[PDB]
Amino acid sequence: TCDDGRTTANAACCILFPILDDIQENLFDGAQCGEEVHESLRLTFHDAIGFSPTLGGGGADGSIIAFSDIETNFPANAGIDEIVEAQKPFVAKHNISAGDFIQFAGAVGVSNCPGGVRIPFFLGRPDAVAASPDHLVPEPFDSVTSILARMGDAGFSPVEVVWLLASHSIAAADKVDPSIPGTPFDSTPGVFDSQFFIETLLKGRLFPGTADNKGEAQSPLQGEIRLQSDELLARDPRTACEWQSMVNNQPKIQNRFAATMSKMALLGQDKTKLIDCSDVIPTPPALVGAAHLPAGFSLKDVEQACAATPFPALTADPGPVTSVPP
Numbered sequence: 509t510c511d512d513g514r515t516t517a518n519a520a521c522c523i524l525f526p527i528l529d530d531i532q533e534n535l536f537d538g539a540q541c542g543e544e545v546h547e548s549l550r551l552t553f554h555d556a557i558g559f560s561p562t563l564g565g566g567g568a569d570g571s572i573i574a575f576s577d578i579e580t581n582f583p584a585n586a587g588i589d590e591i592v593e594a595q596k597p598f599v600a601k602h603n604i605s606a607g608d609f610i611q612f613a614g615a616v617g618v619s620n621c622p623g624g625v626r627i628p629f630f631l632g633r634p635d636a637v638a639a640s641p642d643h644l645v646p647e648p649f650d651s652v653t654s655i656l657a658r659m660g661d662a663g664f665s666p667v668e669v670v671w672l673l674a675s676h677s678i679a680a681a682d683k684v685d686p687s688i689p690g691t692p693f694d695s696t697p698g699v700f701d702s703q704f705f706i707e708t709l710l711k712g713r714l715f716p717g718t719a720d721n722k723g724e725a726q727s728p729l730q731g732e733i734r735l736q737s738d739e740l741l742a743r744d745p746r747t748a749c750e751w752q753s754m755v756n757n758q759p760k761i762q763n764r765f766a767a768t769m770s771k772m773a774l775l776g777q778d779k780t781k782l783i784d785c786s787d788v789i790p791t792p793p794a795l796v797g798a799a800h801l802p803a804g805f806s807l808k809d810v811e812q813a814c815a816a817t818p819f820p821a822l823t824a825d826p827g828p829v830t831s832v833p834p
């Protein structure tokens with residue numbers, strides 16, 4: 509404990525500080541909650557969800573890097589191969605497995621985010637053994653049942669799915685509508701805030717680029733894109749309530765995202781042959797901005813889809829509602 513004099517609870521985890529320091533400088537652009545962080549977060553999902561107790565797949569096993577030429581040609585993995593190519597030199601350079609690195613980079617990346625949380629992290633996943641099977645990654649044009657069943661088959665309850673999707677608060681899309689790459693799922697792609705759950709709950713006005721790409725629904729806001737799957741999920745009897753539940757109190761968004769991610773990172777892996785290295789993850793900057801309806805239009809535009817509970821709705825800020833920049 510440890511070399512720099514930096515510090516953790518179990519010693520096999522000091523291997524992670526050169527990795528951490530390297531990541532922050534050269535992967536994440538001096539550590540910032542931007543594209544490389546978003547794509548790193550997305551990669552933890554596309555690697556780990558590659559798991560089915562019956563259909564096969566090693567889960568959180570680094571397979572999407574180890575067998576990149578195979579998995580990155582899965583149609584559902586469109587746009588992933590660039591972050592794979594981004595991380596490979598760091599995997600090559602260092603002495604942790606591909607699986608560990610993918611999940612480590614995701615954790616670190618989130619902690620960079622304003623409003624972020626620190627996902628627990630474990631060390632010791634073996635090299636991948638085999639490519640994930642195709643057709644295990646939920647696609648944005650899939651039905652709510654299909655998606656709830658895929659995630660469920662991997663072990664998540666429909667409510668765990670809404671929690672994980674808080675990820676989309678720090679998230680954009682390059683491939684859904686190619687003519688508008690880097691267009692986010694909410695107004696604040698740099699901030700881990702509830703804006704995503706709110707803005708997906710507004711009426712859909714327009715298509716931010718070319719109309720009706722597969723998997724795309726109409727957006728409420730120019731400069732923001734909406735997935736068909738987030739739209740359905742927000743309004744479906746099965747997930748509508750918990751979806752609304754997530755409207756401003758970053759607390760539950762932070763608690764639940766942290767713990768379900770921790771759960772996602774262990775798919776196909778076994779926690780008690782791993783060491784806790786969660787202490788290594790950096791402290792995240794506090795939330796800037798309040799969760800607001802994007803002004804201009806009212807609760808007139810919130811499609812309540814939960815009967816049991818009404819809106820948890822703070823009012824909006826002044827006059828118009830302004831741009832959100834891709």
Ligand code: HEM
Pocket residue numbers: 543546547549550552553587646647648649655659669672673675676678679680681682683684685723735737
């Ligand atoms: C459950 C069904 C899900 C569907 C249908 C879905 C769909 C998508 C799609 C279509 C994109 C845009 C990719 C692109 O065109 O550039 C995206 C981005 C993203 N996803 Fe999801 N996703 C799901 C779940 C998740 C989960 C569980 C996570 C947890 C980590 C996650 C994290 C992210 C992140 C961080 C991005 C940002 C990509 C970027 O900024 O480049 N998603 N998702």
Ligand SMILES: [Ca+2]
Pocket residue numbers: 554555556557558566567568569570571572640
């Ligand atoms: Ca995998």
Ligand SMILES: [Ca+2]
Pocket residue numbers: 676677678694695696697698699700701702703704
């Ligand atoms: Ca956000």
Ligand SMILES: [Mg+2]
Pocket residue numbers: 645646647650654
């Ligand atoms: Mg599908």
Ligand SMILES: [Mg+2]
Pocket residue numbers: 543546547680681682690
């Ligand atoms: Mg991207």
